Structure formats: C-alpha cells, structure tokens
C-alpha cells in the first residue's frame, strides 16, 4: 500500500543523492538582482506561486541571494524600489550542497537550520583547467519529501 512506499522510500534515502530529486537550473524560476520591484515585477513574482525565488547576477549559474515573497510585503509598487535594497533588509541564508550528498543528510540539514531550500553544485574536474564549482539547480524539502512518499 502507501505505507510500504513510504518505508521503501525511507530506506533508499541512503542510496539516493540530491542530484536525483533536484530541480535542474534550466527549469528554475529566478530573478535578476538588477530587477526593480514595480507593479509588473512584483505581480509576476507573485504569479509564479513560488514562496522562495533565487536571485542571480549576470549569468544564471551565479546565484548571489534568495528572495522570499514575504519580503515584498510592505514594499510599494509605485515606489519602484530596487531589489538590492530589499535583499539588504532581510538577507536570508543561502545554502550550497554538493550533488553527491545523500538525501538522509540533506533531510537532517533541513531539520536543523531554518532554510527549506539549498543550491546544488558539483566539482568540475575536467582537464586541464582549474577545478571549479558548477551550479546545477535547486533542491528543497518538498523534493526529499516527495522521494520518500513516492
């Protein structure tokens, strides 16, 4: 039944990685730091229905901050307040987890610690250039939850 799916899902938390449950970067809904919060921008953010919205600067693979929708609360559309400003006010923690990370660990890291969101990155070892980190996309609590209720 459903219980048996939960049980199986729970045992396979050791095996599975965050790379398996994650949302690819291409499918991520994000926002530029250079964005201005006006009627249109705020409305679009709200239209997406995402509580947590990654903020990138320049290339999308570069994520410099995180914007919750509750940050848009008393912000006025007619004021045209820059996004940099708001992010300066609240400044929500941004976690980066590696792709080889097990779901067990990721779950524990969500429980302790406030944040329900994490960024997936991997080490690029291709030769001969300097090894660098590569952002693949995001992984949230609802992701690791979904794996374990099938």
């Amino acid at each position: 039944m459903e219980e048996l799916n939960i049980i199986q899902g729970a045992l396979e938390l050791r095996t599975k990685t965050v790379e398996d449950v994650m949302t690819p970067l291409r499918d991520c809904f994000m926002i530029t730091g250079e964005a201005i919060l006006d009627f249109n921008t705020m409305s679009e953010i709200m239209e997406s229905g995402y509580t947590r919205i990654p903020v990138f600067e320049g290339e999308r693979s570069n994520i410099v901050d995180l914007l919750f929708v509750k940050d848009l609360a008393f912000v006025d559309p007619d004021d045209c307040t820059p996004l940099k400003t708001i992010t300066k006010f609240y400044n929500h923690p941004l976690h980066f987890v590696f792709n080889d990370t097990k779901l067990d660990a990721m779950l524990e890291e969500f429980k302790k610690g406030k944040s329900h969101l994490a960024i997936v990155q991997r080490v690029n070892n291709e030769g001969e250039g300097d090894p660098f980190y590569e952002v693949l996309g995001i992984v949230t609590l609802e992701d690791v939850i979904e794996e374990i209720i099938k």
Binding site: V123, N125, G127, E128, G129, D130, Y133
Partner: protein, 151 residues
C-alpha cells in the same frame, strides 16, 4: 574566504572581488590582518585603492590549471620567509578569478615546505575546500622536492 594556519605562517585564500566591492573587500581583508596579496590569475581591478589602504598587491600570473614555474616558486618561498619575519603574525592572501586551482597550490608548496607531509597537507587543504586540485597539480605536489627553505 578560507583561512589556513600552520607554525608561524598564516594564509588566506579568497574569492576574487569586483571593482565596487572593494569597500566591503578591504573591510574583510583588514579583519584577517592581511599585508600582501598575491594575484595568480589576471588583473581584474585597479590596485591603487588597495595599496592606498596599506595592503601591497603582487601579480604573478601563470597558466590555468598548470603548476607554477620555478621562478614563481622561488620568489614565493622568499616572499613567505621574508614577510613572516618582517611582521610576525600577519597574513598573505592568494586569489584568482577561477578558484581552487592555482591559488591553493602556492599555499600547498609553502605548507609542505614548512614541514608538513604531502598527503597530510592536501588533506588539510581539501578538508576546508572540496575538490581544490586538478590532475596536473596533484602530480606537481606529489613529487615536489622540499628544500626546507624555511628553517
């Protein structure tokens, strides 16, 4: 921004700043107690403001993902030995625009030159930052003959 401490010598490997972040950058570097900065990649900003704050900058670039030439290595060891004697307890900063390749290698050379084993050193480095070495660089540090130039 990662701190490395061994014996009397202390190093700090940082991200590469932008031109505007200098205001917030100096604030960081003054906190760790840096004196000298070693730029091993490319020049991304005006060094004028930086040296104006009393922080000397050194540009010793070399090929991406490749071990540093003998020249750079000797100058590096000399720089370490001299600067740590000149002002005991200070710090030397290395950085690059890419990250994890060229900058930690110099630190590793100095580290194994200070009486640390190759394995124990690379482990100490990678523990603070995962990855941090490519194919070519691993070999360079593996087979590096220490001169014990620090003493």
């Amino acid at each position: 921004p990662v701190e490395v401490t061994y014996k009397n010598m202390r190093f700090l490997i940082t991200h590469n700043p932008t031109n505007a972040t200098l205001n917030k950058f100096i604030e960081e570097l003054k906190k760790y107690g840096v004196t000298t900065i070693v730029r091993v990649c490319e020049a991304t900003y005006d060094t004028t403001l930086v040296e104006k704050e009393g922080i000397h900058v050194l540009d010793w670039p070399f090929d991406d993902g490749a071990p540093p030439s003998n020249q750079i290595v000797d100058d590096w060891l000399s720089l370490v030995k001299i600067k740590f004697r000149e002002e005991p307890g200070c710090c030397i900063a290395v950085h690059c625009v890419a990250g994890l390749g060229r900058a930690p290698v110099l630190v590793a050379l100095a580290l194994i030159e200070g009486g640390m084993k190759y394995e124990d050193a690379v482990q100490f480095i990678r523990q603070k930052r995962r990855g941090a070495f490519n194919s070519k660089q691993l070999l360079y540090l593996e087979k590096y003959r220490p001169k014990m130039r620090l003493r």
